[PDB]
Amino acid sequence: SPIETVPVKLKPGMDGPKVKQWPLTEEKIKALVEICTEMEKEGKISKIGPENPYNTPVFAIKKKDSTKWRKLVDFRELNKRTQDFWEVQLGIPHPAGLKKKKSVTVLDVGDAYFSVPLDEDFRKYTAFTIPSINNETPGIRYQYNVLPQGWKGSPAIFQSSMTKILEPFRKQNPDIVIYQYMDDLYVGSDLEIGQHRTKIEELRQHLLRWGLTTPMGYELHPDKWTVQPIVLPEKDSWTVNDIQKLVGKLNWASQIYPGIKVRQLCKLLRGTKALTEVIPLTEEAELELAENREILKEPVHGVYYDPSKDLIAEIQKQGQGQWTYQIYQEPFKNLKTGKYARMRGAHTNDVKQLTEAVQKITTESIVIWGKTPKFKLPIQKETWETWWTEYWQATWIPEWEFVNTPPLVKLWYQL
Amino acid sequence: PISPIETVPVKLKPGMDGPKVKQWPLTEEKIKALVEICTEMEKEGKISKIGPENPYNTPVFAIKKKDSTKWRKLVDFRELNKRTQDFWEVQLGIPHPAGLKKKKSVTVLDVGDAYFSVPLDEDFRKYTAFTIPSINNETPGIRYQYNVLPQGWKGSPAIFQSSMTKILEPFRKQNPDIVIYQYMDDLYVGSDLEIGQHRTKIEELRQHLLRWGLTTPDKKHQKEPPFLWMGYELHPDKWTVQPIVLPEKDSWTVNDIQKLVGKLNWASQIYPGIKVRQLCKLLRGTKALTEVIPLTEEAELELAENREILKEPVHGVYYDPSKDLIAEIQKQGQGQWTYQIYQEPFKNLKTGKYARMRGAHTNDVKQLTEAVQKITTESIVIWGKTPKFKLPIQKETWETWWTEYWQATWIPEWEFVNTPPLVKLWYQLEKEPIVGAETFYVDGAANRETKLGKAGYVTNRGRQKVVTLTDTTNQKTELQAIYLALQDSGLEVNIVTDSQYALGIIQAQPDQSESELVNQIIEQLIKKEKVYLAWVPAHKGIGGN
């Protein structure tokens, strides 16, 4: 077994995580205790004594598509304190091409980690507790011996063994983009779908040869990731209310889009006219109206991804199963604004939906910038905290604040 | 004894090293006592004599001190505590009576000399040294170091625990039918086994601890029900809060209102009904524990209902993991809600209450969900499962509101329960403009230094008004403006503001507020019959804006 541990070092002065554990259902506690008594006979983890002051939270998800309980460790914290190690020393590079593929496939390769082993000295940072109910039993405390799934140091370590794994496949199909982000490998190609699907089956065996099984995706197509112009409505008979409402949208986009103008139409609004009252459009305004319309489907202009900077994501509830989204680094400076819409069943589940859009958007940043965003989630903390897993399925977790949508911001973006 | 259990490897916080604190000299008297105390302790393996070598020292003291005439050794672990590493708080919450499974037979075992019966990591004894000084600190003191968990020391709680966890392990394993609540230095065993294999299963549990260093009580000593535990009264088939008594005082001090408000939330847990909003409003000092404060009529009015509620006993049932939990909430008055969790109609596992989000622009629809929320969290905590929700709200009311609101809002499982007051929205802003309704284009402003704002409206029917304001804010003026338009508009009005602020506030149908300007506007709005409200960038054309 003996493969030299990669001496992992926390950041200078920064201390290990001491994150509280969330009270869990007894269903996931049971399922964890199992997933965990199995992982220890495989020597993957080891109980730890109170002599350990650290703690990362843990939870139980339900295997995207393949429903059967999976452990999910929340290492966001440890990952921040570990940030020099993964991001800097052993940083894994973002293919610019991945966002352009006719198709991209996500494969989970976190079972790869279990094999390779963890720096005897780093393993304390990795402790987690498996709660009881009503505090009879104390927590079943554990700690890792082999790169964890969820900790970003791992892919950064394994990088060298992954390039070996893919070297013949990469050699044989040099136009296939492989990009590994955490526990997933992103596989992109311009192949036809059946060829793609095939290239990914082949790629799957190569993996199996090392122990990374699954007897694909999310099947993504970044190629077809087109916009959402802020979208103004098509002319006719405009009331005062509607002029007042476009001058509003246009005002706001003017803040993001350059060639914007609203003086032509704003003109008509110097009044004390009743808003049901109709008003003719002095042509010069159909000119202003249109000039903007053209712009609206055309890439802000001076907005560029700055790698030094965090990503931010806002999400609006639009009702009707719709939700919209903006991804930017500096407020108003949108680098990406799509929209996720309801796929029924849990027809009336507002959380079921927010949780899916947070993963759709997280996925796409991962494919566009190779990083996840910080969500401004139009929801109440506790509610999210309580229910965010009953529907969660990604192996990672991005960062989140809880916000309060401005009534008009939900508006402009309304499609 | 001194458990054979492994030791847990204790270390010092990093940039550190053992404390080296000086022994102020001691009274001949206390010196003699420390010396007797230490001698027995030593004879029991609890401590051990030491070299002049060991540099460390944490001071000793000895207190009697009244109805005692027998004293005890007190150790200042204060410094040693600022240098001992950090430990795991392995008990994130303490058992609530309402989650204690309803167990046939229950046994209570309190370990004797708990920290003293557990080894302390060899390489660490060294740091725990104290010194019994010689009469005038003349000679050199007698020096010791612990072999066990010092009382008062940092990691004793943490360590005594792992130590008992491990011991209890292979017992539970070969005895899963058996429930061992490990609290502090107690062991609460319960099972549905009958005094038969029960008081015989318990003497087996015991036997295991002794084989392992831990003394406990015989059936002759093991206490019996009700167990007056941690503020509660536990019988085998029902629990309640421990005996509450509201003071027959004529003149209430801030302090004594606080204790009332405390006891009042304690009882709160099983005594459905309890209100505390009116006595809590009084709690807004000043300060002064000894400050006697006058009770509002509303207060004397609460305390009285509470006095009634607590007339006679209310007890609560225990849990059955096979039956569902039903949670029912009710509207006790403004931002005042109650619930009760039961499994069988009306035999209550437990009660509780919920008071506003300081109710700072909110409506009952928002308040219920905060309660359903708080309640959802407690069941997870307590029972490992959410309950079924019976709410004084209508299915359509909930959906009209949820569908329309910008925050993802999500109640799990519920049913209407026609138990007035039912929860309702008090008015609704229109979706489209009222044709044939006056458009007040409202406005408002404030001067920062002066702090003098104006507030007016100007209509499409040519009207106007321009009220003048004092000691005001840009916010406060944009709402007084909207207030004005509501006052002089009648039944159906359109109102165009430049205030994202107010729009925002009104749009979420508040039906209560901390601000009375906001309160006026609520009183309006409900009166009207049609109110479309709309927004415009200010400093733009927008005449009226």
Ligand SMILES: Cc1n[nH]c2ccc(F)c(Oc3cc(C#N)cc(C#N)c3)c12
């Ligand atoms: C162990 C038990 N299982 N069910 C149950 C019902 C009632 C009751 F009393 C009790 O024991 C106790 C539990 C705790 C706890 N937690 C505390 C005490 C005490 N004293 C006793 C139990």
